[PDB]
Amino acid sequence: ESSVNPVVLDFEDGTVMSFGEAWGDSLKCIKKVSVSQDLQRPGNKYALRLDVEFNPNNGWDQGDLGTWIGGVVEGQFDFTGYKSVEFEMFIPYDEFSKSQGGFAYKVVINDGWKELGSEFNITANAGKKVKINGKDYTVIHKAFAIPEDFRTKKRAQLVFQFAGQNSNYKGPIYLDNVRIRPEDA
Ligand SMILES: [Ca+2]
Numbered sequence: 001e002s003s004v005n006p007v008v009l010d011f012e013d014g015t016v017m018s019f020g021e022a023w024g025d026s027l028k029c030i031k032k033v034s035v036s037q038d039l040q041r042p043g044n045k046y047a048l049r050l051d052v053e054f055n056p057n058n059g060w061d062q063g064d065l066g067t068w069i070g071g072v073v074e075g076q077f078d079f080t081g082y083k084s085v086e087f088e089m090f091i092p093y094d095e096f097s098k099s100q101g102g103f104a105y106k107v108v109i110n111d112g113w114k115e116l117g118s119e120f121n122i123t124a125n126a127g128k129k130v131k132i133n134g135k136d137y138t139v140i141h142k143a144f145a146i147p148e149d150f151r152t153k154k155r156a157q158l159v160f161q162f163a164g165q166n167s168n169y170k171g172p173i174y175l176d177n178v179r180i181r182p183e184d185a
Pocket of ligand 1 (some may be wrong): 010011012044045046093176177
């Protein structure tokens with residue numbers, strides 16, 4: 001089987017789907033990675049919970065979270081015919097709204113540290129606000145292109161970098177619906 005089937009890391013098997021440190025001691029601001037039912041709702045039972053603690057004196061309080069597309073560590077994945085990577089992030093709105101500063105993220109195919117996209121200065125007023133299980137969440141949703149030069153066999157590590165920007169936020173950030181897609185961005 002050589003396909004261009006969508007690769008959908010939605011945590012719906014109730015595992016972390018190979019998410020963890022991108023390299024030794026890389027998690028840093030991310031104090032725990034777990035599979036969580038906190039956002040359990042019709043059609044969507046599990047998400048990846050990242051317990052973070054940012055320091056408000058640190059302008060770039062980074063941590064790096066990786067997964068292996070295919071689960072095989074130091075495996076290659078053939079990105080031929082894949083054109084975008086999509087994801088959603090959820091941050092509890094009331095707690096995040098009380099925090100100072102903001103946070104940034106990068107989405108990277110880590111074969112030569114190739115950034116697909118990034119955003120900075122995320123606060124509770126970014127994206128959209130959605131109520132889940134009694135609680136409002138700030139929701140970030142983006143699709144970034146896989147550039148044509150990377151649509152080939154590459155080291156199969158997808159990395160999410162998170163960085164506190166003079167933030168004092170201490171709480172979960174949830175990741176869900178990470179898709180490596182044949183569709184364009
Ligand atoms: Ca899910």
